[PDB]
From Swiss-Prot:
Disulfide bonds: none annotated. The keyword Transcription applies. Belongs to the flavin monoamine oxidase family. Changing H384A: Strongly reduces demethylase activity. The N-terminal sequences of INSM1 and SNAI1 compete with histone H3 for the same binding site and thereby inhibit histone demethylation (in vitro). The gene is KDM1A. It is an enzyme of class 1 (oxidoreductase). This is Lysine-specific histone demethylase 1A. It comes from the Eukaryota. There is a cross-link at K271 (Glycyl lysine isopeptide (Lys-Gly) (interchain with G-Cter in SUMO2)). It is found in: Nucleus; Chromosome. Residues 257-334 form a coiled coil.
Length: 642
């Protein structure tokens, strides 16, 4: 299934046309289904040709010469499919050799706000389409939230560092184009408690099992019993989790109660049984006395078959007594669980919640119970990988040949029914400003900058209410890293990651996870959830000291030398980001991502949007950013080039 795999790798069903293709090829969708079969094959085959060699431009001509008969005869259809694929960034995207050099005459001018992956991806597309494009970047580097530290042989990412499974991932193509080295993340993640001792395989698995069960429960509660609103306030994932935990504790307490009652009941039956036996002994004594006084040949017989009958009674009770002392001791030896989670178990469980806070870049109490995993259905297949040589290799290579103006911060964006003006200032001399005129503006401003109050950049006219309302509802998280560069490796080189279990629920996200990913002796420590924003207020030295303390508790002091180099990110305080990435906040939904993607048009579309926050099925990702850029380049070219 070569062509079939090509469609998969392109996130398209191989045997049916998408709604997009239906709209662009209405004559095919509403026509002979045999022609649709032909359409799909041309489409799947063209994708295969491009995917099999993503370093070279796939021209219409080369596509035609590589298609087998009878397909190579339907010249017009092939061109229509090739044009569509190319326009929408499914082929000829990223970085590749052009066999058809760009035309000197550039049509239409577009200003791209932001030199991150979304802006870079859109820029390269728009340029290859023959448009005049210039990127305005506030920083003194490209890449935005993809940021790599490089010094000597030391390499470390302060922003994006993980690639999520290549099957269907556009980054698979970009990886090949820039020769980026990817290493699969080994699953083994040993956990160490606050005292530094490792958590036994048993408990680790047990608690991880409970974590999974608790999450599954919140999903059942949400997508079955429709428990998504309470007191008119949307329910958060954190909220639902604590409720599920409470029920588990209630259930444990109930089975404990019932058990104690079995004990008490058995204990009462015994006391009462012992009491009638004591009375039967007193009744036997009444006989082993008195009994012994000439008709006796019949009086002794009588007193005998009488005194014995009282033993066919007594030791008979000692029997029905042994069946209780047995039942009793059996119960007081097999007690149900005393608690749902021991104090130590709860801390380990909090580590798993912190991990989830890292993945969504926000405390669980802010996540939408109903929509936090709204995009799960779009995950790519395969192991998640890490960028051994620094993720910045992508934006750096994508910037090749582009007209990028660094140290240029945009402060105003004017858009009228007949053109656009973008005002920016030099960040090195806020005295001098710049005024760039253009036909269209592509804003790849991070959601955190768009939420900023007072606003960092002004829109004239101001953005619509349906747009600003979406920006306000959507969540924008935070996550930070501490890069520790050593001259020696004192950790287990075969382990990619290991966790640090915090002491309290509130600080569970503080330096809870360490990553071993590079050539040089470098460790990355994460700061998630509530800890992320707070720790930004701590100086590098103090935060590094707390890292070494964690490390020394694990590997022993004297084993951990002082770091030669350290880097600490503070994404929330970074004025060009104001956070790490978006998340679906309680009260928001995947629809806000669609609203974020909508162009603003006063008589015709003028202001466009790209960025990790404008792509519903792939939010908060580098690939999502990439795709949003390809998407917008297509929408813009359609408007200005037709
Ligand atoms: C910061 C950060 C982010 C991540 C991550 C870590 C950190 C510390 N990692 C996390 O460790 C895990 C997270 C992840 C892993 C697996 C699945 C999903 C996500 C990840 C990662 O590994 N992998 C990933 O794909 N994305 C990450 N993310 C998110 C991705 O990095 C982003 O979604 C993606 O890089 C976003 O690119 P973009 O093009 O949408 O936006 P920016 O790159 O922010 O560019 C906007 C530009 O506007 C510029 N600017 C600001 N004001 C200006 C103005 N008005 N005019 C001129 N320029 C302006 C800013 O400098 C900025 O460069």
């Amino acid at each position: 299934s070569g062509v079939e795999g090509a469609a998969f790798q392109s996130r398209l069903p191989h045997d049916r046309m998408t709604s997009q293709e239906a709209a662009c090829f209405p004559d095919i969708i509403s026509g002979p289904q045999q022609t649709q079969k032909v359409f799909l094959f041309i489409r799947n085959r063209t994708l295969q040709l491009w995917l099999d060699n993503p370093k070279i431009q796939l021209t219409f001509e080369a596509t035609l010469q590589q298609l087998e008969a009878p397909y190579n005869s339907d010249t017009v259809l092939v061109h229509r499919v090739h044009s569509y694929l190319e326009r929408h960034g499914l082929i000829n995207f990223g970085i590749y050799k052009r066999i058809k050099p760009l035309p000197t005459k550039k049509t239409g001018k577009v200003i791209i706000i932001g030199s991150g992956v979304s802006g870079l991806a859109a820029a390269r597309q728009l340029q290859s389409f023959g448009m005049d494009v210039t990127l305005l970047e506030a920083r003194d580097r490209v890449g935005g939230r993809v940021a790599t530290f490089r010094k000597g042989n030391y390499v470390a990412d302060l922003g994006a560092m993980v690639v999520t499974g290549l099957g269907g991932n556009p980054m698979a193509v970009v990886s090949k184009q820039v020769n980026m080295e990817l290493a699969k993340i080994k699953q083994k993640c040993p956990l160490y408690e606050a005292n530094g001792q490792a958590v036994p395989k048993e408990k680790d698995e047990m608690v991880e099992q409970e974590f999974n069960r608790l999450l599954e429960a919140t999903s059942y509660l949400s997508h079955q019993l429709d428990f998504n609103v309470l007191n008119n306030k949307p329910v958060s994932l954190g909220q639902a989790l604590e409720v599920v935990i409470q029920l588990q504790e209630k259930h444990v307490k109930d089975e404990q109660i019932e058990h104690w009652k079995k004990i008490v009941k058995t204990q009462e039956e015994l006391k009462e049984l012992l009491n009638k036996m004591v009375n039967l002994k007193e009744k036997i004594k009444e006989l082993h006395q008195q009994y012994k006084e000439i008709t006796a040949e019949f009086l002794v017989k009588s007193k005998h078959r009488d005194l014995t009958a009282l033993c066919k009674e007594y030791d008979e009770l000692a029997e029905t007594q042994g069946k209780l002392e047995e039942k009793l001791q059996e119960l007081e030896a097999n007690p149900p669980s005393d608690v749902y989670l021991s104090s130590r178990d709860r801390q380990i469980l909090d580590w798993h919640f912190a991990n989830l806070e890292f993945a969504n870049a926000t405390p669980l109490s802010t996540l939408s119970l109903k929509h936090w995993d709204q995009d799960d259905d779009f995950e790519f297949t395969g192991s998640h990988l890490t960028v051994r040589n620094g993720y910045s290799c992508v934006p750096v290579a994508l910037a090749e040949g582009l007209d990028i103006k660094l140290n240029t911060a945009v402060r105003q964006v004017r858009y009228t029914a007949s053109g656009c003006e973008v005002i920016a200032v030099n960040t090195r001399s806020t005295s001098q400003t710049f005024i760039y005129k253009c036909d269209a503006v592509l804003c790849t401003l991070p959601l955190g900058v768009l939420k900023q109050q007072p606003p960092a950049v002004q829109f004239v006219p101001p953005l619509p209410e349906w747009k600003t309302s979406a920006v306000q509802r959507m969540g924008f998280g935070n996550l930070n890293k501490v890069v520790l560069c050593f001259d020696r490796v004192f950790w287990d080189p075969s382990v990619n990651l290991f966790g640090h279990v915090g002491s309290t629920t509130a600080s569970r996200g503080e330096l809870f996870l360490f990553w071993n990913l590079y050539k040089a002796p470098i460790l990355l420590a994460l700061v998630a959830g509530e800890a992320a924003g707070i720790m930004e207020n701590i100086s590098d030295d103090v935060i590094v000291g707390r890292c070494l303390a964690i490390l020394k508790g694990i590997f022993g002091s004297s084993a951990v030398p002082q770091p030669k180099e350290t880097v600490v990110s503070r994404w929330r305080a970074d004025p060009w980001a104001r956070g790490s990435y978006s998340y679906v906040a309680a009260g928001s939904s995947g629809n806000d991502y669609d609203l974020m993607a909508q162009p603003i048009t006063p008589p015709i579309p003028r202001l466009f949007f790209a960025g990790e926050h404008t792509i519903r099925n792939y939010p908060a990702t580098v690939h999502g950013a990439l795709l949003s850029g390809l998407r917008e380049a297509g929408r813009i070219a359609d408007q200005f080039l037709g």
